[model samples]
Target: TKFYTDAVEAVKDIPNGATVLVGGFGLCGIPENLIGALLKTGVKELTAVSNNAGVDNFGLGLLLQSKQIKRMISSYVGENAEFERQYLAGELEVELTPQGTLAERIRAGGAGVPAFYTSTGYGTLVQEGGSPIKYNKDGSIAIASKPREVREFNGQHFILEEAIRGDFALVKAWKADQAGNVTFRKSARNFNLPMCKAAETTVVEVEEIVDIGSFAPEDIHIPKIYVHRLVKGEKYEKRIERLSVRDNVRERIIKRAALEFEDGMYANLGIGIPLLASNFISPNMTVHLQSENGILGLGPYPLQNEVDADLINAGKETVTVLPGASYFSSDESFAMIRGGHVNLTMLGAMQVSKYGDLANWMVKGMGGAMDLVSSAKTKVVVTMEHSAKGNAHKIMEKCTLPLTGKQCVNRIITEKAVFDVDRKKGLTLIELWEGLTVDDIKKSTGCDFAVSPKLIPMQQVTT
Candidate 1:
């Protein structure tokens, strides 16, 4: 009645012109083999559903090389060159959904919430030309619709869309057992598990294979019942988009230096380089580190035996909690970010515009930048000078991708030098590394920047 194999042979049963949903934010924990099989089959007219399509040479990105996808319903549509190429050429249809909404939509579809209304994407091209605007007496505008002739502003209100369900869902898991139980590592878990419940068929790929019952009940984040198929992948490639080294990393350690904090200051760390700042905090400083996942304690990585299944950071890394620290719902955590309660936020940006715009989230994921930027009293960024290609300068007048937070970025630390983005003037150069001039730095940049008055000749800051 059933057949099982080590390969994605099940894809053969998948007809052409299918709409498939693949999980993973970037290349992180992608279903590598399954997507590869789909590409090798040379299918066409596919509508790919995921956060970002994939990187250029791997994942769903490979599918773009084959001209397979006919449409894409995703949030961050930046990374794939071919996807962008095809999109600009009018060869493919793109329905850009906000990242959080996209994840929740799939969840709602699974939970039987036919449609839900949201204030996200209320204005701008996200809703432009499709709906008429409803303005309040105070001149504030919203796009939500009134249900069944529900009236607001003395007129029938409009309801935001409720997303549809998916036909097939594919995900990547860090580990799985003989019975097909799965668990995701770090941020990779974000939207994958939810999508597993909603799809008609769920395909899971794993790096480590274990016998049935090998995983403890508490260790299994997603049970086997939700998984339809599991494949063992012998290898994986975990790429870091940005590698940061503080110029005074060692010096600060020797001097017992700490992150600058006022007595009651609230702080947040970005995912990558800024993560280390948590280790440099001063004792009793009351530096409230707000995590996107709603935790406020500053702690170190948890040992395997000490791990708490429920406790994780924005990156999904297991961590320990300091005494007096507490956790809350992610909604409350985001509310803190949106309500201007945070004094400072340390974020990672790929290309910070001359205008101090921040773009920390994926070029292809939802741009969750507004609240963190607009509400935070101050912001600091840690990044590298060149992009992943080592050709494009991260300091620019306008962002090449969408802006994460706009005009709220204060200071930016790079591998070469530290810079300050003027709230009014775009990309101003603050400090340069040894033997590097404003012109030399400008060679890699697409725009001009100002040098800081306190600029040093050649500051040794990069790791």
Candidate 2:
């Protein structure tokens, strides 16, 4: 029933120690009032499931500050320093699953499935399992993860992952009606769809509650039964993260990576280098820029007057849509990438091994990166700074971090050079920017790579 306008009452029935599946990709589309109300309700010992842990003071972080959270089954927690401190201090329990796997696990739980097999975590400890779930106050491991059942189908070994069901789900929506049929706006729809049903009871905070027939049957992204309780949510801040950097290194990386696109390609541009590449893309090219959150023909970041809350990109910034834009559910969205329909995907990486394995986030969601990497026909191009602070090479002899995909990255666009990766032939420096010599690259590069037979000086451009 969406008739309840007060958040306090809507969340009143939720018990202490409840496992709350919160909606939001970071802070976007979070149920602010419901969370505040739940905070006011003073529940403790909570288990929270979310994609990103809230930044230090907001979203789920509020509960953590109040010492209400007991566990977090999440894909990413980079934004919350408190989460790290508590985890390292043995004050919290955490279950870190790959982004898509977490979604599938929740979907499987909702659909009455016990467990399912996936290839996402196969070449990593996610299958071999010794991930630390908690640590002692002085920094020793307090708990470690158990391994999963592995099964090989068609010569590919996949690990069986269990379903995850929560006691309650906190959902935020754009609109709903008398029957509680729901419609989400933009990237807000990701993860929230599966979460709505995967919980025992779901409470929704909506921007608007209209009449029963106000929305067409097709407009109902989530049908009535999945939505149990609803409240006319309070004012939303719609916090979006935006960055503006004028570094020539980053600027040229985008410029060069943009050149890799072809006409009529189904492309995905991710955060960092991939996100900025769109501005450098030629308008003469006919490309369908895709986002993991179910958008095709994605447009540029809108001017202040053109910003649309309903058009958040995968990076969660307000953007516009192109003339031939299309939208679908997240399930269908990942299908295009996982099924090899995406032609080229540009990703941001933290490390790239000599064999082309990628490692970007520690315990973060794959966010279609894994699917894109493993896609047989998809070209995986990584855009990143060549080295971190202290000039430590990110293109390493062997990745010191967990692998997202093994022998999968095809190309790397960094500040100094553009390298190509071939599993059997090894990493090859195909292009070097102006003023930098191969020895310069060798000094900066951590791994040994074959200099291409056709290695050429890159075309020069000024910032």
Candidate 3:
């Protein structure tokens, strides 16, 4: 029965130790009112499942601050320092899963599937860990998962991931009818819909609630039958992480990466500088841009005045869509990358070794970088330079940070030069800026490189 006027009343009876599937990617579409209401109940020992923990003071962070969450099953935790501190101090339990895999796991649970195999974590640390499910009083591992069974298919390896179901599902929707049909706005739709069916009871918070038949049947994202309770949500801040800013150095990196694209090519752009490549792409070139959040045919970021809140990129920034843009679930998005449909992958690297090792997702969770770097057939270009301090080089002899992909970098672009990754010669310096010399690059780089026999001045690709 869906007769709940207040969110607190709806969630008041949930037991202290409950598994909750919270919907949102970043801060978009979080069930704020429900979370606050749940907080008011002082529920403890909750196992929260979310893509992000939100920032330190907001979203799921509120519950984290109250010590309400005992464990978190999430993909990205870099955005929350509190989460980092707690995890490091052994006060919290964390299970890190790949973004696409997490979605499918929830979807599988909802669809009555027990488990599925995926190639995302095949040769990585994801397969190595014995289950660290629960933590002891001092935060030492209390429970460990059994080693996953490895399966081989078509000459490739895959690791089995179990389905995850929750006792309560908390989701936010853009709108809902009194009958409980939900519609999500923009990037907010990412995980909420799948989570609805994955839980025993799904409670929704919406911005607007209208009469039955107010929404056309085809427009409803989750049918009314999936919803158990509904509440009109509170005001939303809808904060943007970083407003789009133009920087000359970033422009240079974007221009350099865009030069790698060929006509009719399908490309996947990672976060940061790689995404800026869309702005510098040649208008005549027919290219399909792939977003890990299940969008393709992406255009440049929308101008402030022309922004559409519903349309966003994988970075969760509002964006404009090209003429033939298409949308699908996260499952299909990863299939495109894992199936080798992407021709080029431009990623941001925290460190790139001379051996072509990449380590971008060290602090941030590896969203889809592993799949794209390993599966792209043509080349993987990394775009990054030293941070503002500039004390250390990003290009290294060996990556000290954890590896995202092995021997996957084909090219690297820095503000001062361009280098090509060659298995025989290591990092090969092929192009230099007009005013910069080879010694200048040597000063900035921590790794050795072979100068190209026919080295040339870098060409201008900026439009």
Q: Whose lDDT is greatest here?
A: 2
Clashes of each: 16, 0, 3
Provide TM-scores for the models: 0.58, 0.89, 0.82
Candidate 3 lDDT tens digits, 1-463: 3957788988887788899999877776678888899889998889999877877887899899989998888888777888877776767788877787788889889988999887666555566666465566676777664556779877667778889899999988888998889888756677787888899989999989988898999988889888998888866666555444228877777787778888999888877787767666778989899877667888877778766545667777777778988765555566677677888888888888887878877535666666777563647888886433646878888888777766778898887888999655689999887788999889888888889999888765758
User: At residue 14, what lDDT does model 1 achieve?
Assistant: 56
Off by over 4 Å in 2: 1-5, 241-247, 363-372, 387-393, 434-453, 459-463
Query: Residue 242's C-alpha lDDT in candidate 2?
Result: 48
TM-score top scorer? 2
The segments of candidate 3 whose C-alpha lies over 4 angstroms from its true place after superposition are 1-3, 130-148, 214-216, 245-252, 297-299, 302-312, 318-329, 353-356, 374-379, 386-398, 414-458
Candidate 3, pairs of clashing residues: 131-144, 131-145, 186-310
* Best of the two (2, 3) by TM-score: 2
Poorest 10 consecutive residues by lDDT, candidate 3: 237-246
Q: How would you encode candidate 1's per-residue C-alpha lDDT over 147-252 as one tens digit per residue?
A: 2211233332222557546677777777888777887765456556766766777777777877778878997878888788777764466543322222554343
lDDT of 2 by residue, 1-463 (tens): 5457688888888788888888777676678778899889998888898866767888888788878898888777776778877887889888787766777788887899999887767776677678888787887887898887889888666789888888989988889988889998876777777788889988898988889999999879899889888888887876655421228888878888878778899898887778767676667778889887667888877778776555677666677788978876555576667667889988989999888888876544455566557664688899898999999989988898778887778999887999998766778999999799999999988989999999987643322
- After TM-score superposition, what is the CA distance of residue 267 in candidate 3 from its true location, in Å? 3.0
